[PDB]
Amino acid sequence: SLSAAEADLAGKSWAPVFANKNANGLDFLVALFEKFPDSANFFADFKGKSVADIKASPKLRDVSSRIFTRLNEFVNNAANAGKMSAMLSQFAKEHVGFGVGSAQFENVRSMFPGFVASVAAPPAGADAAWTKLFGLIIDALKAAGA
Numbered sequence: 001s002l003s004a005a006e007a008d009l010a011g012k013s014w015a016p017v018f019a020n021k022n023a024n025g026l027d028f029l030v031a032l033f034e035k036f037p038d039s040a041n042f043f044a045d046f047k048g049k050s051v052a053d054i055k056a057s058p059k060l061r062d063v064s065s066r067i068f069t070r071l072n073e074f075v076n077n078a079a080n081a082g083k084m085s086a087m088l089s090q091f092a093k094e095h096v097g098f099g100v101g102s103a104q105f106e107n108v109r110s111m112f113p114g115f116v117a118s119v120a121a122p123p124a125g126a127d128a129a130w131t132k133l134f135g136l137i138i139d140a141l142k143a144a145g146a
């Protein structure tokens with residue numbers, strides 16, 4: 001888990017992003033697809049489609065919303081190793097079943113700080129807190145088998 005201090009920094013940086021959940025959630029998915037094209041292929045709903053096609057899809061909101069909803073939960077419980085344990089396990093288990101592994105998360109981790117900064121400058125230390133949180137997710141994926 002993250003420390004209380006680290007967790008607070010992540011929460012602080014996330015707030016402005018989550019303020020506009022719908023628009024920001026869609027934008028995150030789109031930025032992911034643009035920077036890491038192969039990522040779309042894992043999605044039944046977006047495999048083979050171009051970014052323009054994805055943007056125009058009535059399914060985008062459903063997928064993006066579920067992701068943001070869960071990320072918010074990770075941010076909220078990040079400082080509680082216990083809650084994290086369960087969340088991580090479950091998260092990893094679910095992802096692996098879909099064929100998603102740690103490599104994909106390594107990509108999310110690389111682009112995340114930049115995405116946040118595009119909404120509002122994050123406080124000092126927030127970047128390192130996100131990397132640590134993603135690190136925890138990456139570790140979980142590896143234990144889950146991928």
Ligand code: HEM
Nearest residue numbers: 039040042043044045066067068070071098100104105108
């Ligand atoms: C930023 C971190 C992400 C979070 C918090 C997240 C969260 C979730 C959640 C909560 C679900 C289940 C939705 C439901 O059916 O209720 C889901 C499904 C799924 N996720 Fe993730 N995910 C993340 C990143 C990724 C990445 C990087 C990929 C692929 C590269 C991915 C691929 C999938 C796939 C294929 C499904 C199956 C649902 C479907 O596509 O119909 N996720 N995700």
